[PDB]
Amino acid sequence: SKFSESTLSGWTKPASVTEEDRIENTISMIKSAIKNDNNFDNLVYEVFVQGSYGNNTNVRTNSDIDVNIMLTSTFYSKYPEGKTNSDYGFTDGTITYNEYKNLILTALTNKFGTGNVTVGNKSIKITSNSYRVEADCIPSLLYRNYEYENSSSPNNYIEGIKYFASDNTSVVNYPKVHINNGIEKNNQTHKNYKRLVRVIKRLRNKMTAENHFTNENITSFLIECLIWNVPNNYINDYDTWDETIKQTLIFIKSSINDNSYKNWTEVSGMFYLFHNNRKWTSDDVSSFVNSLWSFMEYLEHHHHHH
């Protein structure tokens, strides 16, 4: 085996939290910025953690926290065919996305300072030394998907989020559904699902750092989604991390080769993992898996000599 079980197990650990209450304090500081801004008094909204921190798959203490600020008193919707807002008694909305984003910008600027707020293409970066906030905030509107289960009941929908990037292109995600499904799979695998996610991400980083393989399209979200598609038996049936990773790579390769990967969803189940507008391709993932296979030396080198 290339790496000992102690080494692999170390690489399955969650990133240490240098500040014990970092997530809670970050959420609280952002919530405080909003709740004390009178212009949000008539609005209903949630501040919640998503991404690696939200899924407890973060592997680097230094990474920034993804925080969603989601407006819910005004929302977007996906309806069944032929239905409109008026079929659910809804208006087009009392506030637009851009107006909401500008209110958020004012609130965050009053809290953290104009020099510590930076609008990016996809999120608003807060770098507040004063309040200990290192966060990428995504202002979003709740996204009510009535079409997925064909619900005519206004209160029955799949809940996602929708925002507009700085180029005014639309982005729809289901971070809460993702988080819930990932928790479920962790519960079904004796907590080994997220351990596997973490070690694969760390091996990706190590392959990049040691000049074995680099591909900027192999994102942390992609890796999490790939491992989530690994059937629970490949995680529950083996007694070493070495073997678990070996079988994971065999399965992913086989699933790309036989085209079953085309039916894989992301963790949320609301979009397919591979399609023509993802950053990655199936070739990217095949390359990643092949390079990890060679890096782990699952085919032992001749005479155990590199």
Residue numbers in the entry: 2 to 307
Question: What text does the study give?
Answer:
The native structure of EfCdnE was determined to be a 1.75-Å resolution. When compared with ClCdnE, helix α2 of EfCdnE was shorter by one turn at the N-terminus. The overall root-mean-square deviation (RMSD) is 1.38 Å between 280 matched pairs of Cα atoms. Other significant deviations were observed in the βB’-α3 loop, βD-βE loop, βE-βF loop, and α7-α8 loop. Despite the differences in local regions, the dispositions of the NTase and helical domains were similar in the native structures of ClCdnE, EfCdnE, and LpCdnE, respectively. Similarly, the side chains of Glu267 and Arg279 in EfCdnE are engaged in salt-bridging interactions and would have substantial clashes with the donor base if it were a purine nucleotide. This observation explains why we could not detect the binding of ATP and GTP analogs to EfCdnE in the ITC experiments.
